[PDB]
Amino acid sequence: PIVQNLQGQMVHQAISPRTLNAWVKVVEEKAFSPEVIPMFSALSEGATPQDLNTMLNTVGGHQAAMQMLKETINEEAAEWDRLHPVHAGPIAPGQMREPRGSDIAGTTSTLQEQIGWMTHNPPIPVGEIYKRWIILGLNKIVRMYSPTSILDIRQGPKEPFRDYVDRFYKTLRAEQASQEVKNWMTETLLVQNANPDCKTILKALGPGATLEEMMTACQGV
Amino acid sequence: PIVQNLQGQMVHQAISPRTLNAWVKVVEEKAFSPEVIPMFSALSEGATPQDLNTMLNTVGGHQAAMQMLKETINEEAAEWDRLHPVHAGPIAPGQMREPRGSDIAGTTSTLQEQIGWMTHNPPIPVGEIYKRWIILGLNKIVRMYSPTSILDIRQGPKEPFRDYVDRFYKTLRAEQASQEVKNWMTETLLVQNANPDCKTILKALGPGATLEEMMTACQGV
Ligand SMILES: O=P(O)(O)O[C@H]1[C@H](OP(=O)(O)O)[C@@H](OP(=O)(O)O)[C@H](OP(=O)(O)O)[C@@H](OP(=O)(O)O)[C@H]1OP(=O)(O)O
């Protein structure tokens, strides 16, 4: 985080040990359930790339996943570097050097330049692009850790409908696809994969039946 | 048919050989299934009654069918004679005479007469009336040659609903009862005769359901 001192100049503030330990416990306990992404984005609000690096390195276990995240961050940094070629020439006192692909990731940047980049007007959000790369990696990790694809979620012969819907929507949350495909999956795959006992009821209800109506109608079975 | 020559005068043009060939194929191979009527009504596009008789001689091979067709033509001609009593008196020399029930049927008329009748301002259609009588006869023949009654169209244990609906509608179009009985058949007899699973879904769907919703809800069963 970045805060203003008494004089009003921006000063970095280290993350409290409570937040850091909460994030570490979330990563080590939850495996990589899909709710880690919102929790991470809530715990890392307006943080400098050094803070993100601390929040990532501090994790003790799940080292394979952190390695995959390292690979994804490196690929995104290389692509960004290719997109922005270096402008040769001395930097005027009124500006600062343009951050390269690895300057964003914090492997070759000091704290002061990172503070200066996004506190400048107009701002260049190093933190908000680094967090985008990290979240893009976490999406792949979460998708990998989820057991089964959405197309293989099937209600058992005896399973209650509420548990089946819970499994289906957990898997769909873990799924990686655009929003339109997710809407189609919600509309059709839910009815299509049900057990024979509830499939007839769901078809008889109609094509525009809301989730509440389906679950209250299939409550007994 | 009727065409305009190089001098702007309407002149009869004979039916091309392959159109008569197509009609002969329709008569001899379709076994008077309910689709003979649309194909006749297509092949006889704007034909003077001489061409209608030329196409009709093909049915002369079937003794019973031609007898039914001739009886219906004669009955409609008698009704036409009754409803249009011949007026005795002088007529404007710029107008043609009046077509008798045996002159709209091309039995006692010449080609120039029918050309003048059809190419008139306002036109007096003889081809269309003759075609309507022929279609009445063909409706009677198609009804006679039906293979099964509407009450015997029952979906099989595993026949898809689409095939059953197509069979049912073909049989209903052959039998051609009145309109209200047709609506009652479509609404109720269609649901009644279905196989147990589709019957269950259709009953649970509700009463007064359009065909689209029935076929959409009963798609994969
Ligand atoms: O009554 P037909 O002698 O068999 O005439 C047909 C007819 O031509 P017209 O109606 O212009 O006389 C076809 O026209 P369609 O209405 O089917 O389109 C045409 O076929 P094209 O459409 O391909 O022109 C075909 O011509 P073709 O011989 O090139 O197949 C031609 O048959 P004839 O040429 O033997 O008269």
Swiss-Prot record, chains A, B:
Transmembrane segments: none annotated. It comes from the Viruses. Residues 57-95 are annotated as: Interaction with human PPIA/CYPA and NUP153. The modification Phosphoserine is found at S16. Disulfide bonds: none annotated. Residues 145-221 are annotated as: Dimerization/Multimerization of capsid protein p24. Changing V142T: Loss of infectivity. Residues 85-93 are annotated as: PPIA/CYPA-binding loop. It is found in: Virion. Phosphorylated possibly by host MAPK1; this phosphorylation is necessary for Pin1-mediated virion uncoating. Homodimer; the homodimer further multimerizes as homohexamers or homopentamers. Interacts with host NUP98. Interacts with host PPIA/CYPA; this interaction stabilizes the capsid. Interacts with host NUP153. Interacts with host PDZD8; this interaction stabilizes the capsid. Interacts with host TRIM5; this interaction destabilizes the capsid. Interacts with host CPSF6. Interacts with host NONO; the interaction is weak. Forms the conical core that encapsulates the genomic RNA-nucleocapsid complex in the virion. Most core are conical, with only 7% tubular. The core is constituted by capsid protein hexamer subunits. The core is disassembled soon after virion entry. The capsid promotes immune invasion by cloaking viral DNA from CGAS detection. Host restriction factors such as TRIM5-alpha or TRIMCyp bind retroviral capsids and cause premature capsid disassembly, leading to blocks in reverse transcription. Capsid restriction by TRIM5 is one of the factors which restricts HIV-1 to the human species. This is Capsid protein p24. The gene is gag.
